[PDB]
């Protein structure tokens, strides 16, 4: 979520992803906790006994065979956390995640209903107003002339300065706004 | 691997500003600035019954009697069950009873 995906997943990343997915489907199959712990220790033993492979072509072949076995033995209806995608309560509160720019469009009466919060709001907007020019200058400095470019972003490298493109991250709506 | 110093420093500063923005989402104690109970059976349920039930009772019953029975075939009901031994109110006659019931084993 908070980290941008790279160009490719390394072999270690693929192995750890397969390990986590296999253990999740293992607990989905096992249901009961002692049974899950037993079979999870068995699967950990399997991964450990194939851990110290030195060829890496045999490691890629073992990864391919392992994921074929995983796709054959996976749970048809695995356990999905409710806040995770595919879950029951996934994207449930997006109908309440109202973006912060409607407060610019409220009437003066509704603004007068919340005076000091709005005073803090123009404080935040003015801070954004100087920081935007500073961060555009910083991002123009940080860009390499040519070559690889990733989605990662630099931080503020001097005092009194804010990380570039901070507004949409900091001022995002709360996960449970209501 | 772990967080790069490029990204670990950014997330530390981004989350620090995230605490301040969420801190500013709080409300003052004066917020928002907005410009005969008896018991339940004697007032709460009695005023509801005489206003939301008794008042619509009268307007409905006026339409039922004086605006539905005046039209010919509006309220039509099936004939009531007439058993032997019953007496007709409108006519005043008595339907004769059944036969002698030869089977009474149970």
């Amino acid at each position: 979520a908070f980290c941008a995906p790279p160009a490719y997943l390394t072999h270690q990343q693929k192995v750890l992803r397969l390990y986590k997915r296999a253990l999740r489907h293992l607990e989905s199959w096992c249901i009961h906790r002692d049974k899950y712990r037993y079979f999870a220790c068995l699967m950990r033993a399997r991964f450990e006994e194939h851990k110290n492979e030195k060829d890496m072509m045999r490691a890629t072949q073992l990864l391919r065979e392992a994921e074929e076995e995983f796709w054959q033995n996976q749970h048809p209806q695995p356990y999905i956390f409710p806040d995770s995608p595919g879950g029951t309560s996934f994207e449930r509160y997006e109908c309440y995640k109202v973006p912060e720019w409607c407060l610019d469009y409220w009437h003066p009466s509704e603004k007068a209903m919340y005076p000091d919060y709005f005073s803090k709001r123009e404080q935040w907007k003015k801070l954004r107003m100087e920081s935007w020019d500073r961060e555009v200058k910083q991002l123009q400095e940080e860009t390499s002339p040519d070559g690889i470019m990733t989605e990662a972003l630099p931080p503020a490298r001097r005092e009194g300065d804010l990380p570039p493109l901070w507004w949409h991250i900091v001022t995002r709506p709360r996960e449970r706004p209501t | 691997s772990g967080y790069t110093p490029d990204e670990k420093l950014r997330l530390q500063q981004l989350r620090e500003l995230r605490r301040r923005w969420l801190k500013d989402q709080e409300l003052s104690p004066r917020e928002p600035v907005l410009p005969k109970n008896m018991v339940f059976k004697a007032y709460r349920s009695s005023l509801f019954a005489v206003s939301h039930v008794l008042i619509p009772m009268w307007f409905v019953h006026y339409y039922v009697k004086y605006h539905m029975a005046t039209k010919p075939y509006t309220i039509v009901s099936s004939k009531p069950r007439i058993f032997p031994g019953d007496t007709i109110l409108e006519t005043g006659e008595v339907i004769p009873p059944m036969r002698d019931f030869p089977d009474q084993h149970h």
Partner: peptide, 13 residues
């Protein structure tokens, strides 16, 4: 209680 400000559209209009 720790009440928090909720963001709403302009329902005044």
């Amino acid at each position: 209680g720790k009440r928090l400000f909720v963001v709403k559209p302009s329902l005044y209009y």
